[PDB]
Design a protein around this ligand. Structure first.
Ligand SMILES: N[C@H](Cc1ccccc1)C(=O)N1CCC[C@H]1C(=O)NCc1ccc(Cl)s1
Ligand SMILES: N[C@H](Cc1ccccc1)C(=O)N1CCC[C@H]1C(=O)NCc1ccc(Cl)s1
Ligand code: NA
Ligand code: NA
Lengths: 33, 11, 253
C-alpha cells in the first residue's frame, strides 16, 4: 500500500543519506527544538 | 519535444 | 519552477507527471500517495474558462521521472487512469477554492528506488509545521521563467518559506480562503523562487523534524505571474481537505 513507509525515500532516509538542501528546511523549523 | 512512449501505453 | 535547481536522483520519488496522450505533452504535476492513488490540482483537469475538461482516457500518469522529455526506460512507469474525482465544491468560477482532485490508477504501481509515496499530514503535524517562516519544498517540470532558459531538462526543486496570512491577502486582489496558503520570499529577503505554469498540481512538501518523514502540505494552485516581487505562490491546503480525500478513498478504493 505504502502506508508504513510513506515519506521515507529509498535513496535518502532509507539509507541514512541526506539531500543537499533538506537542512535548509530543518533550520527553518523552530517548534520543538 | 517529448520522446515517443511505448505504444502499449496508448492502446 | 523559477530560480530553483536540478533535483537529485530519487529526491522526490512521489513526483508524478500528468501527460496528455494526444498531442503528447506535459499537462501538470501530481503526487503519489499510495500504490493506486495520485493527488493533483482540480484545475489540471477542469477549468472551463480555458475550455479544459479532461476525461480519464485523455491522460496518462508517468511516475519515477527525472528527465522532462525523455522516455526513461527501466526507471519510469506509466499508468492509465481508472477514475478522476474532483472536489464537488471546487471553485473554478472565482478563486480556485478547494483546488484538489484525486486519480485512481487502473493497476497498482510497483515501488522502487525512484517511485515511493509521500505522507499526508495529520492535524498535529500540520499545526506544528504550517507556520510563517517554516520552509517547504516545491518540485516540477514547469517553466523556468514567467515569459520566454524556458523549460527544464530535468525536474526542478525550490525551497520556500510559508508566508503570514495577512501578507498573502495583501499581495493580491483575489479572495483567499482557509483552504489556501501562500509561500515565497519577500522582496527584502533577497532570495527568490516560485512555481510557474506547468508546475500546477505538484506537491509542496515538508520534512517533519519529529519523525523524519516527508509530508505533503500543499498542492501548487495559483499565482499572478511567476517569481514577481511582492507576489507569492498559492497552494491548496491539503489537511483542510482531509475529510474529502478520506471519503473518496474509503468509498472507491
Ligand atoms: N494567474 C491565475 C490567477 C487566478 C485566476 C483565477 C482563479 C484563481 C487564480 C492562475 O494562477 N491560474 C488560472 C487558473 C490556473 C491558475 C494557474 O495558472 N496556476 C499555475 C501556477 C502558476 C504560478 C503558480 Cl505559483 S501556480
Ligand atoms: N486508508 C489509507 C491507508 C494508506 C495507504 C497508503 C498510504 C497511506 C495510507 C489512507 O489513509 N490513505 C490512502 C492514501 C491517503 C490516505 C488517506 O486517505 N488520508 C486522508 C488524509 C489524512 C490526512 C490528510 Cl492531511 S488527508
Ligand atoms: Na488583498
Ligand atoms: Na514573489
Amino acid at each position: 500500500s505504502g502506508e508504513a513507509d510513506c515519506g521515507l525515500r529509498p535513496l535518502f532516509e532509507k539509507k541514512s543519506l541526506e539531500d543537499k538542501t533538506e537542512r535548509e528546511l530543518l533550520e527553518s523549523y523552530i517548534d520543538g527544538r | 519535444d517529448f520522446e515517443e512512449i511505448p505504444e502499449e501505453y496508448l492502446q | 519552477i523559477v530560480e530553483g535547481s536540478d533535483a537529485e536522483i530519487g529526491m522526490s520519488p512521489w513526483q508524478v507527471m500528468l501527460f496528455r496522450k494526444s498531442p503528447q505533452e506535459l499537462l501538470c504535476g501530481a503526487s503519489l500517495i499510495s500504490d493506486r492513488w495520485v493527488l493533483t490540482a482540480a484545475h489540471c483537469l477542469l477549468y472551463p474558462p480555458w475550455d479544459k475538461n479532461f476525461t480519464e482516457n485523455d491522460l496518462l500518469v508517468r511516475i519515477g521521472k527525472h528527465s522532462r522529455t525523455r522516455y526513461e526506460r527501466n526507471i519510469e512507469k506509466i499508468s492509465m487512469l481508472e477514475k478522476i474525482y474532483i472536489h464537488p465544491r471546487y471553485n473554478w468560477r472565482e478563486n480556485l477554492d478547494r483546488d484538489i482532485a484525486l486519480m485512481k490508477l487502473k493497476k497498482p504501481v510497483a515501488f522502487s528506488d525512484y517511485i515511493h509515496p509521500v505522507c499526508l499530514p495529520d492535524r498535529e503535524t500540520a499545526a506544528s509545521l504550517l507556520q510563517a517562516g517554516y520552509k517547504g519544498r516545491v518540485t516540477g517540470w514547469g517553466n523556468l521563467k514567467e515569459t520566454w532558459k524556458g523549460q527544464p531538462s530535468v525536474l526542478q526543486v525550490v525551497n520556500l518559506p510559508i508566508v503570514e496570512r495577512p501578507v498573502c491577502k495583501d499581495s493580491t486582489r483575489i479572495r483567499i480562503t482557509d483552504n489556501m496558503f501562500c509561500a515565497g520570499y519577500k522582496p527584502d529577503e533577497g532570495k527568490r523562487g516560485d512555481a510557474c505554469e506547468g508546475d500546477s498540481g505538484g506537491p509542496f512538501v515538508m520534512k517533519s523534524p519529529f519523525n523524519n518523514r516527508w509530508y505533503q502540505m500543499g498542492i501548487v494552485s495559483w499565482g499572478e505571474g511567476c517569481d514577481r516581487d511582492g507576489k507569492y505562490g498559492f497552494y491548496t491546503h491539503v489537511f483542510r481537505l482531509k475529510k474529502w480525500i478520506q471519503k473518496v478513498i474509503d468509498q472507491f478504493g
